[PDB]
Amino acid sequence: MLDALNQGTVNWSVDDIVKGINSSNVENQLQATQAARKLLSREKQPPIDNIIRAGLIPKFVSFLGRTDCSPIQFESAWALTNIASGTSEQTKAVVDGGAIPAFISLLASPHAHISEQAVWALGNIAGDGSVFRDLVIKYGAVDPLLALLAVPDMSSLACGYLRNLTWTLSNLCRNKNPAPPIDAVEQILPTLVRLLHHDDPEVLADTCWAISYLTDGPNERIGMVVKTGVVPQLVKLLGASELPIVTPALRAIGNIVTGTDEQTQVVIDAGALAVFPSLLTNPKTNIQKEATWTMSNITAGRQDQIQQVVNHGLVPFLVSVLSKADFKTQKEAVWAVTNYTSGGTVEQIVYLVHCGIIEPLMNLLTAKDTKIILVILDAISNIFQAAEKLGETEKLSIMIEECGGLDKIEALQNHENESVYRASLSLIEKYFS
């Protein structure tokens, strides 16, 4: 019944656990609790419902408060968490048994490894959905969670512990319907901001993820993030060599430029455009895709913003990706071109055409995707409008003819797709007759 660690074992019955856990002997209570966490920590087929049916949750929860015996606090935190990591109903049973406030009080243990358990517990529950997340917040988890990081140097804290607390904060930032209560976000941001200057790769990755969640919302949310001055540091991390940093850094920058024109300018002012050559030629196609998407949202902005895209020499990269990247990225490149031609100046559209946008664009008119064809034709239209202003519609017509583009446009003349038939007929009637 005891192993060579003097702990309870997986060989204890529920009968045994119930007896031990109800004893006045503290060592017996601890062994019963160890036997329970060992049973419940089996990855596969843990007998969670048997422990719940033995009415044991309220007892495990009161053990969380047993300062006289930190190992009992640890072992019961562990068991409860394992229970909570099960079905939604199993989690709901842990919560209904009062575990959240008890975990929150446990953050005050002067034992790092105990307060660490509480952080871990609350992270698990918070991430079990928006509803639990809000319960964790409503019960007051935020203040004590942050107080653990209110120290002079974060580096006084062990890497493991910091990783664990950062992970838990990012779950308080995660999910929608509904999104995190705004005042909790206000409270948390300044700490995330300090975390982005820490130099542990996993801490940085977790914090970038949290920021990406906060920036996935209405502009009010984007603004809050932007107003902290993190954007520059986010841009620095875009440059990081670690893909697990670059990926959420990129998502966050991508989200921010879906915001207002001023919000996008903060991104440009921080020097993001300079990182785009390495992103747009990054072997990971997901990065190319996210990067091109971001670029599509910058070329949807103002003319002096489009001008910075040009000034950083990014247009040939865009041509390159429109030509010879995987299709999902090519779709973002179509958007980037359509946006750029929708808002750019005449001179900017002349430059885009001199970079050789036309052939790659025309080639995509064989795509079997109606949305994409209609957008490409929209882009074609915008380029023609600029040629009108120079009285050069005809020289563009000729550029389109020679790279096989008039053929691809003629090929859309099929009534089976009435939408595509009309778009393409009009274009043919106006500039190819």
> Quick one: residue 129, left, alpha or beta (phi over 0 = left, psi -120 to 50 = alpha)?
left
- Please, how many CA atoms are within 13 Å of residue 409, restricted to the half-sphere of its CB? 28
Where are the alpha helices (H) located in 325-368, listed in sequence order?
327-343, 346-354, 358-363
3 state DSSP class of 230: coil
- Contact (Cβ atoms closer than 8 angstroms) between residue 17 and residue 35: yes
Based on the structure, what is the number of domains in the chain? 1
What token pair was written down for 105?
Answer: 């009080």
HSE (CB half, 13 Å, CA atoms) of 124? 24
The C-alpha angle with vertex 343 and arms to 337 and 349, in degrees rounded to 5, equals 60
CA distances 158 to 112, 154, 196, 198, 291, Å, are 9, 9, 16, 12, 34
CATH number of the structural domain spanning residue 318: 1.25.10.10
Domain residues for the domain of 110 are 1-433
Task: Compute CA distances 210 → 52, 187, 216, 225, 336, whole Å.
Answer: 34, 14, 10, 11, 27
DSSP string, 135-174: HHHHTT-HHHHHHTT-SS-GGGS-HHHHHHHHHHHHHHT-
The method of structure determination was: X-ray
Unique residue bearing structure tokens 């779950």 = 171
In the 8-state DSSP scheme, what is residue 155?
G
